[PDB]
PDB file of all heavy atoms in Angstrom:
ATOM      1  N   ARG I 111       9.008  40.171 -25.856  1.00  2.00           N
ATOM      2  CA  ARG I 111       8.662  38.790 -26.162  1.00  2.00           C
ATOM      3  C   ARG I 111       8.691  37.919 -24.911  1.00  2.00           C
ATOM      4  O   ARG I 111       7.791  37.092 -24.694  1.00  2.00           O
ATOM      5  CB  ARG I 111       9.608  38.247 -27.221  1.00  2.00           C
ATOM      6  CG  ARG I 111       9.404  38.866 -28.572  1.00  2.00           C
ATOM      7  CD  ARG I 111      10.640  38.684 -29.414  1.00  2.00           C
ATOM      8  NE  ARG I 111      10.350  38.698 -30.840  1.00  2.00           N
ATOM      9  CZ  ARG I 111      10.210  39.795 -31.566  1.00  2.00           C
ATOM     10  NH1 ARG I 111      10.316  40.997 -31.027  1.00  2.00           N
ATOM     11  NH2 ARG I 111       9.963  39.686 -32.865  1.00  2.00           N
ATOM     12  N   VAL I 112       9.713  38.089 -24.069  1.00  2.00           N
ATOM     13  CA  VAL I 112       9.808  37.248 -22.879  1.00  2.00           C
ATOM     14  C   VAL I 112       8.629  37.501 -21.956  1.00  2.00           C
ATOM     15  O   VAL I 112       8.007  36.560 -21.442  1.00  2.00           O
ATOM     16  CB  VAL I 112      11.144  37.477 -22.159  1.00  2.00           C
ATOM     17  CG1 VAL I 112      11.159  36.734 -20.858  1.00  2.00           C
ATOM     18  CG2 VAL I 112      12.267  36.993 -23.020  1.00  2.00           C
ATOM     19  N   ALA I 113       8.291  38.770 -21.735  1.00  2.00           N
ATOM     20  CA  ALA I 113       7.132  39.067 -20.908  1.00  2.00           C
ATOM     21  C   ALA I 113       5.874  38.486 -21.526  1.00  2.00           C
ATOM     22  O   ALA I 113       4.971  38.034 -20.811  1.00  2.00           O
ATOM     23  CB  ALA I 113       6.988  40.571 -20.712  1.00  2.00           C
ATOM     24  N   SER I 114       5.793  38.488 -22.857  1.00  2.00           N
ATOM     25  CA  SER I 114       4.631  37.908 -23.511  1.00  2.00           C
ATOM     26  C   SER I 114       4.487  36.447 -23.138  1.00  2.00           C
ATOM     27  O   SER I 114       3.398  35.990 -22.774  1.00  2.00           O
ATOM     28  CB  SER I 114       4.745  38.068 -25.022  1.00  2.00           C
ATOM     29  OG  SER I 114       3.641  37.465 -25.664  1.00  2.00           O
ATOM     30  N   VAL I 115       5.590  35.703 -23.189  1.00  2.00           N
ATOM     31  CA  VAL I 115       5.532  34.290 -22.817  1.00  2.00           C
ATOM     32  C   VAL I 115       5.094  34.148 -21.367  1.00  2.00           C
ATOM     33  O   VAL I 115       4.184  33.371 -21.037  1.00  2.00           O
ATOM     34  CB  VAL I 115       6.888  33.609 -23.051  1.00  2.00           C
ATOM     35  CG1 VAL I 115       6.963  32.326 -22.259  1.00  2.00           C
ATOM     36  CG2 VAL I 115       7.068  33.323 -24.510  1.00  2.00           C
ATOM     37  N   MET I 116       5.725  34.918 -20.486  1.00  2.00           N
ATOM     38  CA  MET I 116       5.465  34.755 -19.064  1.00  2.00           C
ATOM     39  C   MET I 116       4.001  35.004 -18.745  1.00  2.00           C
ATOM     40  O   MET I 116       3.402  34.275 -17.951  1.00  2.00           O
ATOM     41  CB  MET I 116       6.359  35.686 -18.253  1.00  2.00           C
ATOM     42  CG  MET I 116       6.529  35.260 -16.813  1.00  2.00           C
ATOM     43  SD  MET I 116       7.866  36.141 -15.998  1.00  2.00           S
ATOM     44  CE  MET I 116       9.075  36.118 -17.303  1.00  2.00           C
ATOM     45  N   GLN I 117       3.400  36.023 -19.357  1.00  2.00           N
ATOM     46  CA  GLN I 117       1.992  36.280 -19.086  1.00  2.00           C
ATOM     47  C   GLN I 117       1.121  35.209 -19.702  1.00  2.00           C
ATOM     48  O   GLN I 117       0.206  34.694 -19.053  1.00  2.00           O
ATOM     49  CB  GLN I 117       1.561  37.641 -19.618  1.00  2.00           C
ATOM     50  CG  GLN I 117       0.089  37.938 -19.342  1.00  2.00           C
ATOM     51  CD  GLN I 117      -0.856  37.329 -20.364  1.00  2.00           C
ATOM     52  OE1 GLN I 117      -0.447  36.959 -21.462  1.00  2.00           O
ATOM     53  NE2 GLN I 117      -2.123  37.202 -19.997  1.00  2.00           N
ATOM     54  N   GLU I 118       1.375  34.872 -20.968  1.00  2.00           N
ATOM     55  CA  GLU I 118       0.556  33.872 -21.631  1.00  2.00           C
ATOM     56  C   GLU I 118       0.487  32.615 -20.796  1.00  2.00           C
ATOM     57  O   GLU I 118      -0.486  31.859 -20.872  1.00  2.00           O
ATOM     58  CB  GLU I 118       1.125  33.567 -23.014  1.00  2.00           C
ATOM     59  CG  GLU I 118       0.472  32.403 -23.703  1.00  2.00           C
ATOM     60  CD  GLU I 118       1.204  31.121 -23.462  1.00  2.00           C
ATOM     61  OE1 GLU I 118       2.447  31.159 -23.410  1.00  2.00           O
ATOM     62  OE2 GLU I 118       0.534  30.081 -23.308  1.00  2.00           O
ATOM     63  N   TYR I 119       1.501  32.397 -19.969  1.00  2.00           N
ATOM     64  CA  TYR I 119       1.558  31.155 -19.228  1.00  2.00           C
ATOM     65  C   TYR I 119       0.554  31.108 -18.081  1.00  2.00           C
ATOM     66  O   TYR I 119       0.348  30.032 -17.519  1.00  2.00           O
ATOM     67  CB  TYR I 119       2.970  30.956 -18.701  1.00  2.00           C
ATOM     68  CG  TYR I 119       3.407  29.528 -18.697  1.00  2.00           C
ATOM     69  CD1 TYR I 119       3.881  28.944 -19.853  1.00  2.00           C
ATOM     70  CD2 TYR I 119       3.329  28.759 -17.566  1.00  2.00           C
ATOM     71  CE1 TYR I 119       4.285  27.652 -19.881  1.00  2.00           C
ATOM     72  CE2 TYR I 119       3.732  27.453 -17.585  1.00  2.00           C
ATOM     73  CZ  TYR I 119       4.208  26.906 -18.746  1.00  2.00           C
ATOM     74  OH  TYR I 119       4.613  25.597 -18.779  1.00  2.00           O
ATOM     75  N   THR I 120      -0.035  32.241 -17.687  1.00  2.00           N
ATOM     76  CA  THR I 120      -1.004  32.274 -16.594  1.00  2.00           C
ATOM     77  C   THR I 120      -2.455  32.175 -17.035  1.00  2.00           C
ATOM     78  O   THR I 120      -3.339  32.182 -16.176  1.00  2.00           O
ATOM     79  CB  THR I 120      -0.863  33.545 -15.765  1.00  2.00           C
ATOM     80  OG1 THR I 120      -1.564  33.359 -14.536  1.00  2.00           O
ATOM     81  CG2 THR I 120      -1.493  34.708 -16.479  1.00  2.00           C
ATOM     82  N   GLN I 121      -2.736  32.136 -18.332  1.00  2.00           N
ATOM     83  CA  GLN I 121      -4.100  31.981 -18.811  1.00  2.00           C
ATOM     84  C   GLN I 121      -4.339  30.656 -19.509  1.00  2.00           C
ATOM     85  O   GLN I 121      -5.454  30.407 -19.965  1.00  2.00           O
ATOM     86  CB  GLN I 121      -4.458  33.116 -19.766  1.00  2.00           C
ATOM     87  CG  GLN I 121      -5.914  33.489 -19.760  1.00  2.00           C
ATOM     88  CD  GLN I 121      -6.223  34.576 -20.751  1.00  2.00           C
ATOM     89  OE1 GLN I 121      -5.440  34.840 -21.659  1.00  2.00           O
ATOM     90  NE2 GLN I 121      -7.366  35.224 -20.582  1.00  2.00           N
ATOM     91  N   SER I 122      -3.337  29.796 -19.592  1.00  2.00           N
ATOM     92  CA  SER I 122      -3.492  28.521 -20.270  1.00  2.00           C
ATOM     93  C   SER I 122      -4.223  27.554 -19.348  1.00  2.00           C
ATOM     94  O   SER I 122      -4.812  27.943 -18.339  1.00  2.00           O
ATOM     95  CB  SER I 122      -2.134  28.002 -20.710  1.00  2.00           C
ATOM     96  OG  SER I 122      -1.509  28.937 -21.570  1.00  2.00           O
ATOM     97  N   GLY I 123      -4.189  26.267 -19.680  1.00  2.00           N
ATOM     98  CA  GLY I 123      -4.948  25.273 -18.955  1.00  2.00           C
ATOM     99  C   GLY I 123      -4.072  24.454 -18.027  1.00  2.00           C
ATOM    100  O   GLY I 123      -3.047  23.910 -18.437  1.00  2.00           O
ATOM    101  N   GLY I 124      -4.492  24.383 -16.769  1.00  2.00           N
ATOM    102  CA  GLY I 124      -3.888  23.470 -15.819  1.00  2.00           C
ATOM    103  C   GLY I 124      -2.420  23.694 -15.538  1.00  2.00           C
ATOM    104  O   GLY I 124      -1.649  22.730 -15.525  1.00  2.00           O
ATOM    105  N   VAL I 125      -2.002  24.940 -15.336  1.00  2.00           N
ATOM    106  CA  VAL I 125      -0.629  25.240 -14.949  1.00  2.00           C
ATOM    107  C   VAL I 125      -0.650  26.310 -13.872  1.00  2.00           C
ATOM    108  O   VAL I 125      -1.696  26.852 -13.520  1.00  2.00           O
ATOM    109  CB  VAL I 125       0.237  25.712 -16.126  1.00  2.00           C
ATOM    110  CG1 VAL I 125       0.122  24.763 -17.282  1.00  2.00           C
ATOM    111  CG2 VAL I 125      -0.177  27.086 -16.534  1.00  2.00           C
ATOM    112  N   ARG I 126       0.530  26.598 -13.344  1.00  2.00           N
ATOM    113  CA  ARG I 126       0.775  27.668 -12.396  1.00  2.00           C
ATOM    114  C   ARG I 126       1.912  28.533 -12.912  1.00  2.00           C
ATOM    115  O   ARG I 126       2.816  28.033 -13.583  1.00  2.00           O
ATOM    116  CB  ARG I 126       1.143  27.117 -11.015  1.00  2.00           C
ATOM    117  CG  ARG I 126       2.385  26.261 -10.999  1.00  2.00           C
ATOM    118  CD  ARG I 126       3.249  26.626  -9.818  1.00  2.00           C
ATOM    119  NE  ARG I 126       4.509  25.898  -9.789  1.00  2.00           N
ATOM    120  CZ  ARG I 126       5.543  26.161 -10.574  1.00  2.00           C
ATOM    121  NH1 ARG I 126       5.493  27.113 -11.485  1.00  2.00           N
ATOM    122  NH2 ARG I 126       6.656  25.450 -10.438  1.00  2.00           N
ATOM    123  N   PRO I 127       1.902  29.816 -12.613  1.00  2.00           N
ATOM    124  CA  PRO I 127       2.902  30.714 -13.198  1.00  2.00           C
ATOM    125  C   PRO I 127       4.309  30.409 -12.727  1.00  2.00           C
ATOM    126  O   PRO I 127       4.509  29.503 -11.918  1.00  2.00           O
ATOM    127  CB  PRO I 127       2.453  32.095 -12.720  1.00  2.00           C
ATOM    128  CG  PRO I 127       1.075  31.912 -12.261  1.00  2.00           C
ATOM    129  CD  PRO I 127       0.966  30.537 -11.749  1.00  2.00           C
ATOM    130  N   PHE I 128       5.293  31.139 -13.228  1.00  2.00           N
ATOM    131  CA  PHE I 128       6.664  30.944 -12.794  1.00  2.00           C
ATOM    132  C   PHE I 128       6.879  31.555 -11.416  1.00  2.00           C
ATOM    133  O   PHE I 128       5.958  32.069 -10.782  1.00  2.00           O
ATOM    134  CB  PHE I 128       7.620  31.534 -13.814  1.00  2.00           C
ATOM    135  CG  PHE I 128       7.502  30.911 -15.145  1.00  2.00           C
ATOM    136  CD1 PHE I 128       6.586  31.373 -16.051  1.00  2.00           C
ATOM    137  CD2 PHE I 128       8.296  29.851 -15.491  1.00  2.00           C
ATOM    138  CE1 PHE I 128       6.468  30.789 -17.276  1.00  2.00           C
ATOM    139  CE2 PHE I 128       8.182  29.268 -16.715  1.00  2.00           C
ATOM    140  CZ  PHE I 128       7.269  29.737 -17.608  1.00  2.00           C
ATOM    141  N   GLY I 129       8.108  31.469 -10.929  1.00  2.00           N
ATOM    142  CA  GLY I 129       8.449  32.063  -9.658  1.00  2.00           C
ATOM    143  C   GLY I 129       9.723  32.877  -9.696  1.00  2.00           C
ATOM    144  O   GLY I 129      10.534  32.776  -8.776  1.00  2.00           O
ATOM    145  N   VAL I 130       9.935  33.669 -10.740  1.00  2.00           N
ATOM    146  CA  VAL I 130      11.198  34.370 -10.916  1.00  2.00           C
ATOM    147  C   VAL I 130      10.957  35.835 -11.235  1.00  2.00           C
ATOM    148  O   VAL I 130       9.921  36.206 -11.790  1.00  2.00           O
ATOM    149  CB  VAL I 130      12.028  33.731 -12.034  1.00  2.00           C
ATOM    150  CG1 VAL I 130      12.470  32.358 -11.631  1.00  2.00           C
ATOM    151  CG2 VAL I 130      11.205  33.664 -13.272  1.00  2.00           C
ATOM    152  N   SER I 131      11.934  36.672 -10.885  1.00  2.00           N
ATOM    153  CA  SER I 131      11.997  38.058 -11.330  1.00  2.00           C
ATOM    154  C   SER I 131      13.298  38.248 -12.089  1.00  2.00           C
ATOM    155  O   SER I 131      14.359  37.842 -11.610  1.00  2.00           O
ATOM    156  CB  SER I 131      11.931  39.031 -10.159  1.00  2.00           C
ATOM    157  OG  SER I 131      10.632  39.074  -9.612  1.00  2.00           O
ATOM    158  N   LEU I 132      13.221  38.853 -13.263  1.00  2.00           N
ATOM    159  CA  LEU I 132      14.355  38.915 -14.165  1.00  2.00           C
ATOM    160  C   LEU I 132      14.911  40.327 -14.254  1.00  2.00           C
ATOM    161  O   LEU I 132      14.175  41.309 -14.153  1.00  2.00           O
ATOM    162  CB  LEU I 132      13.969  38.444 -15.559  1.00  2.00           C
ATOM    163  CG  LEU I 132      14.115  36.956 -15.818  1.00  2.00           C
ATOM    164  CD1 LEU I 132      13.389  36.156 -14.776  1.00  2.00           C
ATOM    165  CD2 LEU I 132      13.604  36.622 -17.191  1.00  2.00           C
ATOM    166  N   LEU I 133      16.224  40.420 -14.438  1.00  2.00           N
ATOM    167  CA  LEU I 133      16.897  41.676 -14.729  1.00  2.00           C
ATOM    168  C   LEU I 133      17.700  41.506 -16.005  1.00  2.00           C
ATOM    169  O   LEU I 133      18.523  40.589 -16.104  1.00  2.00           O
ATOM    170  CB  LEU I 133      17.803  42.100 -13.576  1.00  2.00           C
ATOM    171  CG  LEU I 133      17.085  42.588 -12.325  1.00  2.00           C
ATOM    172  CD1 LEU I 133      17.944  42.393 -11.101  1.00  2.00           C
ATOM    173  CD2 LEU I 133      16.751  44.043 -12.490  1.00  2.00           C
ATOM    174  N   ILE I 134      17.464  42.390 -16.969  1.00  2.00           N
ATOM    175  CA  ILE I 134      18.047  42.305 -18.300  1.00  2.00           C
ATOM    176  C   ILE I 134      18.867  43.559 -18.552  1.00  2.00           C
ATOM    177  O   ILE I 134      18.419  44.669 -18.246  1.00  2.00           O
ATOM    178  CB  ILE I 134      16.960  42.161 -19.381  1.00  2.00           C
ATOM    179  CG1 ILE I 134      16.166  40.880 -19.191  1.00  2.00           C
ATOM    180  CG2 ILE I 134      17.582  42.155 -20.749  1.00  2.00           C
ATOM    181  CD1 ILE I 134      16.880  39.672 -19.665  1.00  2.00           C
ATOM    182  N   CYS I 135      20.059  43.389 -19.120  1.00  2.00           N
ATOM    183  CA  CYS I 135      20.937  44.510 -19.421  1.00  2.00           C
ATOM    184  C   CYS I 135      21.443  44.414 -20.849  1.00  2.00           C
ATOM    185  O   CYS I 135      21.656  43.318 -21.372  1.00  2.00           O
ATOM    186  CB  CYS I 135      22.124  44.551 -18.478  1.00  2.00           C
ATOM    187  SG  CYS I 135      23.278  43.201 -18.717  1.00  2.00           S
ATOM    188  N   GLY I 136      21.645  45.574 -21.473  1.00  2.00           N
ATOM    189  CA  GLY I 136      22.163  45.583 -22.832  1.00  2.00           C
ATOM    190  C   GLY I 136      22.757  46.920 -23.217  1.00  2.00           C
ATOM    191  O   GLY I 136      22.577  47.929 -22.535  1.00  2.00           O
ATOM    192  N   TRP I 137      23.467  46.916 -24.348  1.00  2.00           N
ATOM    193  CA  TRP I 137      24.125  48.123 -24.862  1.00  2.00           C
ATOM    194  C   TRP I 137      24.006  48.143 -26.384  1.00  2.00           C
ATOM    195  O   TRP I 137      24.840  47.573 -27.091  1.00  2.00           O
ATOM    196  CB  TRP I 137      25.579  48.176 -24.418  1.00  2.00           C
ATOM    197  N   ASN I 138      22.970  48.810 -26.882  1.00  2.00           N
ATOM    198  CA  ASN I 138      22.743  48.951 -28.312  1.00  2.00           C
ATOM    199  C   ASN I 138      22.545  50.420 -28.647  1.00  2.00           C
ATOM    200  O   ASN I 138      21.877  51.147 -27.906  1.00  2.00           O
ATOM    201  CB  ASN I 138      21.527  48.145 -28.768  1.00  2.00           C
ATOM    202  N   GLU I 139      23.130  50.848 -29.767  1.00  2.00           N
ATOM    203  CA  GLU I 139      23.049  52.235 -30.226  1.00  2.00           C
ATOM    204  C   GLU I 139      23.614  53.205 -29.191  1.00  2.00           C
ATOM    205  O   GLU I 139      23.064  54.281 -28.953  1.00  2.00           O
ATOM    206  CB  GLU I 139      21.612  52.610 -30.594  1.00  2.00           C
TER     207      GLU I 139
END
Side-chain angles (χ1 to χ4, degrees), chain I residues 111-136:
Chain I
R111 291 159 154 83
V112 173
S114 178
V115 161
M116 201 167 318
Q117 180 277 342
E118 171 266 323
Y119 216 82
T120 195
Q121 210 182 17
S122 301
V125 309
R126 60 136 184 76
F128 299 87
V130 293
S131 288
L132 271 53
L133 288 155
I134 298 282
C135 69

